[PDB]
Design an enzyme around this catalytic site. Sequence first.
Site, PDB file in Angstrom:
ATOM      1  N   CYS A   1       8.269  -2.474   9.187  1.00 14.75           N
ATOM      2  CA  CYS A   1       7.822  -3.581  10.026  1.00 14.75           C
ATOM      3  C   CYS A   1       8.897  -4.647  10.082  1.00 14.75           C
ATOM      4  O   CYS A   1       9.738  -4.728   9.192  1.00 14.75           O
ATOM      5  CB  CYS A   1       6.482  -4.139   9.496  1.00 14.75           C
TER       6      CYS A   1
ATOM      7  N   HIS B   1       8.308  -0.323   3.664  1.00 14.80           N
ATOM      8  CA  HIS B   1       7.674  -1.538   4.148  1.00 14.80           C
ATOM      9  C   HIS B   1       8.843  -2.474   4.444  1.00 14.80           C
ATOM     10  O   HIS B   1       9.954  -2.283   3.920  1.00 14.80           O
ATOM     11  CB  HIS B   1       6.793  -2.164   3.061  1.00 14.80           C
ATOM     12  N   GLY B   2       8.602  -3.482   5.275  1.00 16.38           N
ATOM     13  CA  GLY B   2       9.658  -4.413   5.605  1.00 16.38           C
ATOM     14  C   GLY B   2       9.191  -5.621   6.382  1.00 16.38           C
ATOM     15  O   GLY B   2       8.024  -5.704   6.770  1.00 16.38           O
TER      16      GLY B   2
ATOM     17  N   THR C   1       0.829  -1.196   0.000  1.00 13.08           N
ATOM     18  CA  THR C   1       0.000   0.000   0.000  1.00 13.08           C
ATOM     19  C   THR C   1       0.867   1.251   0.000  1.00 13.08           C
ATOM     20  O   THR C   1       2.003   1.224   0.467  1.00 13.08           O
ATOM     21  CB  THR C   1      -0.914   0.027   1.230  1.00 13.08           C
TER      22      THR C   1
HETATM   23  C1  LIG Z   1       5.427  -2.327   7.677  1.00 16.38           C
HETATM   24  O1  LIG Z   1       6.463  -2.656   7.113  1.00 16.38           O
HETATM   25  C2  LIG Z   1       4.633  -3.559   7.113  1.00 16.38           C
HETATM   26  N1  LIG Z   1       4.496  -3.724   5.626  1.00 16.38           N
HETATM   27  C3  LIG Z   1       5.545  -4.657   5.112  1.00 16.38           C
HETATM   28  C4  LIG Z   1       3.128  -4.164   5.202  1.00 16.38           C
HETATM   29  C5  LIG Z   1       2.547  -5.539   5.651  1.00 16.38           C
HETATM   30  C6  LIG Z   1       1.175  -5.398   6.341  1.00 16.38           C
HETATM   31  C7  LIG Z   1       0.321  -6.673   6.205  1.00 16.38           C
HETATM   32  C8  LIG Z   1      -1.142  -6.352   5.842  1.00 16.38           C
HETATM   33  C9  LIG Z   1      -1.856  -7.510   5.118  1.00 16.38           C
HETATM   34  C10 LIG Z   1       4.770  -0.958   7.475  1.00 16.38           C
HETATM   35  C11 LIG Z   1       5.825   0.183   7.673  1.00 16.38           C
HETATM   36  C12 LIG Z   1       5.460   1.591   7.183  1.00 16.38           C
HETATM   37  O2  LIG Z   1       5.841   2.572   7.889  1.00 16.38           O
HETATM   38  O3  LIG Z   1       4.830   1.718   6.097  1.00 16.38           O
HETATM   39  N2  LIG Z   1       3.724  -0.815   8.485  1.00 16.38           N
HETATM   40  C13 LIG Z   1       2.424  -0.628   8.203  1.00 16.38           C
HETATM   41  O4  LIG Z   1       1.990  -0.471   7.064  1.00 16.38           O
HETATM   42  C14 LIG Z   1       1.464  -0.608   9.415  1.00 16.38           C
HETATM   43  C15 LIG Z   1       1.249  -2.066   9.901  1.00 16.38           C
HETATM   44  C16 LIG Z   1       0.762  -2.164  11.359  1.00 16.38           C
HETATM   45  N3  LIG Z   1       0.124   0.073   9.244  1.00 16.38           N
HETATM   46  C17 LIG Z   1      -1.055  -0.763   8.801  1.00 16.38           C
HETATM   47  C18 LIG Z   1      -2.294  -0.229   8.644  1.00 16.38           C
HETATM   48  C19 LIG Z   1      -3.553  -1.024   8.275  1.00 16.38           C
HETATM   49  C20 LIG Z   1      -4.457  -1.138   9.519  1.00 16.38           C
HETATM   50  C21 LIG Z   1      -3.203  -2.455   7.781  1.00 16.38           C
HETATM   51  C22 LIG Z   1      -4.337  -0.296   7.163  1.00 16.38           C
HETATM   52  N4  LIG Z   1      -2.463   1.162   8.892  1.00 16.38           N
HETATM   53  C23 LIG Z   1      -1.394   2.009   9.305  1.00 16.38           C
HETATM   54  N5  LIG Z   1      -1.705   3.309   9.505  1.00 16.38           N
HETATM   55  C24 LIG Z   1      -3.040   3.873   9.712  1.00 16.38           C
HETATM   56  C25 LIG Z   1      -3.527   3.528  11.126  1.00 16.38           C
HETATM   57  N6  LIG Z   1      -4.516   2.655  11.302  1.00 16.38           N
HETATM   58  O5  LIG Z   1      -4.759   2.530  12.683  1.00 16.38           O
HETATM   59  N7  LIG Z   1      -3.859   3.381  13.376  1.00 16.38           N
HETATM   60  C26 LIG Z   1      -3.099   4.002  12.479  1.00 16.38           C
HETATM   61  C27 LIG Z   1      -2.014   4.996  12.878  1.00 16.38           C
HETATM   62  C28 LIG Z   1       0.011   1.425   9.503  1.00 16.38           C
HETATM   63  O6  LIG Z   1       0.922   2.165   9.873  1.00 16.38           O
END
Ligand SMILES: *[C@@](=O)([C]N([C])[C][C][C][C][C][C])[C]([C]C(=O)[O-])[N]C(=O)[C]([C][C])N1[C]=C(C([C])([C])[C])N=C([N][C]C2=NON=C2[C])C1=O
Lengths: 140, 140, 91, 91
Positions: B130, B88-89, B29
């Site tokens: 991550c 992402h990671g 995403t």
């Molecule tokens: C991290 O690396 C993970 N990557 C590899 C994606 C894998 C997720 C699996 C889903 C099927 C990535 C690092 C980054 O800084 O971009 N972390 C995220 O994307 C995090 C994961 C906890 N993340 C996820 C999500 C949703 C809930 C999956 C949409 N949303 C947010 N931010 C919005 C948010 N929603 O609730 N509180 C907040 C602050 C997010 O950072």
Amino acid sequence: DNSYKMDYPEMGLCIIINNKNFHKSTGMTSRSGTDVDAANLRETFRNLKYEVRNKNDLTREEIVELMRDVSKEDHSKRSSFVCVLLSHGEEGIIFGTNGPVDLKKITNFFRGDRCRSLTGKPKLFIIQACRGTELDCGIE
Amino acid sequence: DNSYKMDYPEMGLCIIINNKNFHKSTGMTSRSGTDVDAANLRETFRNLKYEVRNKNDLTREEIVELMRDVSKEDHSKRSSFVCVLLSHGEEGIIFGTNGPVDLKKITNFFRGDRCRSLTGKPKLFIIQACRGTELDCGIE
Amino acid sequence: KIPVEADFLYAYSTAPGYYSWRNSKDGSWFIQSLCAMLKQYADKLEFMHILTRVNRKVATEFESFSFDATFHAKKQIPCIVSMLTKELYFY
Amino acid sequence: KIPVEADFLYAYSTAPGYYSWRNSKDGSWFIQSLCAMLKQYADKLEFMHILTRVNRKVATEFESFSFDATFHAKKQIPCIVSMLTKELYFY
Ligand SMILES: *[C@@](=O)([C]N([C])[C][C][C][C][C][C])[C]([C]C(=O)[O-])[N]C(=O)[C]([C][C])N1[C]=C(C([C])([C])[C])N=C([N][C]C2=NON=C2[C])C1=O
Ligand SMILES: *[C@@](=O)([C]N([C])[C][C][C][C][C][C])[C]([C]C(=O)[O-])[N]C(=O)[C]([C][C])N1[C]=C(C([C])([C])[C])N=C([N][C]C2=NON=C2[C])C1=O
């Protein structure tokens, strides 16, 4: 306040697990010199006011069982917790006298929601063991 | 002397890799908000006197290529080195816009015997990504 | 509400993926260094800085000596992993 | 002669095996907390101490809010990994 409250009635426990001899069925060599570390840590942490407990040659079962019981104790009057592991190992693993034990498993007994009386208190894990087979040849 | 010599003519480089948009095929995403981080980091390290270099949306190949080149630069007149990765990671991995990169891969370029002009100098890797799929529900 | 992984500190004797050395009569490089550092500074330095001193002592004062070329003249660097929320003082 | 893995510092935004959180408008919890602490303390505090302040700020002031129950009300703790041999001051 950006400094842990270390003025509880007691500094806390210091569990030292020193594994020197391993079952033949493992192929692990005897860790000569480890007793020196064990005794050294006991004196060091006694001087720091920690209630030290030494445990030698424990099987994986004995390690998990020990760590599980220590976490179930009431640490309310203790400022912190210290665990020292002396044995062979791999990345994320430490060996009981009879086999491997994942570090995450013994560490989880002490995670926030797991060990209420240690919540918000410093939990230290000092680990002397290998984390792989890469050698550092050094430089300069 | 228990503190790094930071009186060289230059504090050093601050390489910031801001990956926001990923190739459709990856299923990653868009990392909304990452630009705010990149800009924030740029200003912060500018105030700390680092030569900041922002790079956006790099492929796995470009990340590696950039890191190799930077490590091949002459850091003799620099006190340290900073690299910030926003993306992402997974455990021990960071994603280029088109795929995964092992952190050990880009980190190796700067290891003691590899980047002589930085030997004995602090090498900092700040990583926003991550390291798995475990969630922390908190306590109390 | 705090993270359940918060307030943990792991003082590894070596870096991820690496071997960790022990001397037959003196004990492991890391433990003897940790004890010696705690002895001189536990009453002054914050724990992280004491562990940094340990990192320096192990990295500089130790090297392997083996008749086996494969394990000869090797070095070691400890690995401090902190999820601590505050500074730690043993006094 | 020093270890080739010495003098490295890995400031991870989160613990091993865990997710890292990001806010769509403010940026990641880790980076914004890191920048805030560096802005306020880089002129006096040693780096490990600044990072410990980041740890506390991230674990204390942030919690996720999601329409998706699975990802709602979650916390985060950063992870400082140090193979440093000396204290680091940005001045
Ligand atoms: C991290 O690396 C993970 N990557 C590899 C994606 C894998 C997720 C699996 C889903 C099927 C990535 C690092 C980054 O800084 O971009 N972390 C995220 O994307 C995090 C994961 C906890 N993340 C996820 C999500 C949703 C809930 C999956 C949409 N949303 C947010 N931010 C919005 C948010 N929603 O609730 N509180 C907040 C602050 C997010 O950072
Ligand atoms: C470490 O945990 C486990 N090792 C042995 C890996 C096992 C995983 C299985 C992979 C197939 C252990 C640490 C401990 O405290 O016991 N590491 C050692 O035993 C280390 C390894 C670097 N080690 C090895 C050796 C020889 C060379 C293989 C015999 N020798 C010593 N000490 C003697 C020495 N030789 O040269 N300098 C010295 C101090 C040693 O510590």
